Amino acid sequence: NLFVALYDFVASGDNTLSITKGEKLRVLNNTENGEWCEAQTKNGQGWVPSNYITPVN
């Protein structure tokens, strides 16, 4: 479940997580992933747009 961020995204609140273009992240197998998916990086865990990331492996 390794992904890389395609575009910068800035958390606006509501358990969202900021990510940076090129950042590697892990998508947790959260039971409620959807248009948004729960990601994990060194800056925390939180929702990111599913269309802003792409799988790596």
Numbering used by the authors: 64 to 120
Paper text:
However, the interchange of one or two loops within the Abl SH3 domain produces a noticeable reduction in its stability but does not promote the formation of 3D domain-swapped oligomers. In this way, the ΔG values are the same for the WT and Abl_Src-RT, but the Abl_Src-nSrc and Abl_Src-2 chimeras show a noticeable loss of stability. Although the conformation is slightly different in the RT loop, the hydrogen bonds are conserved. However, Src_Abl-nSrc shows an ordered distal loop in most of the molecules in the asymmetric unit and this chimera does not form the intertwined dimer. The same behaviour can be observed in the Abl_Src chimeras, where the distal loop shows low B factors. Indeed, even though the Abl_Src chimeras are less stable, this reduction in stability does not allow formation of the intertwined dimer.
Three-dimensional domain swapping (3D-DS) is a mechanism by which some proteins can oligomerize by exchanging identical domains or structural elements between monomers. In previous work, the 3D-DS of the c-Src SH3 domain has been characterized and its dependence on experimental conditions has been described. This work explores the role of the hinge-loop composition by interchanging residues in the RT and n-Src loops between two SH3 domains: one being the c-Src SH3 domain, where 3D-DS has been described, and the other being the Abl SH3 domain, where 3D-DS has not been described to date.
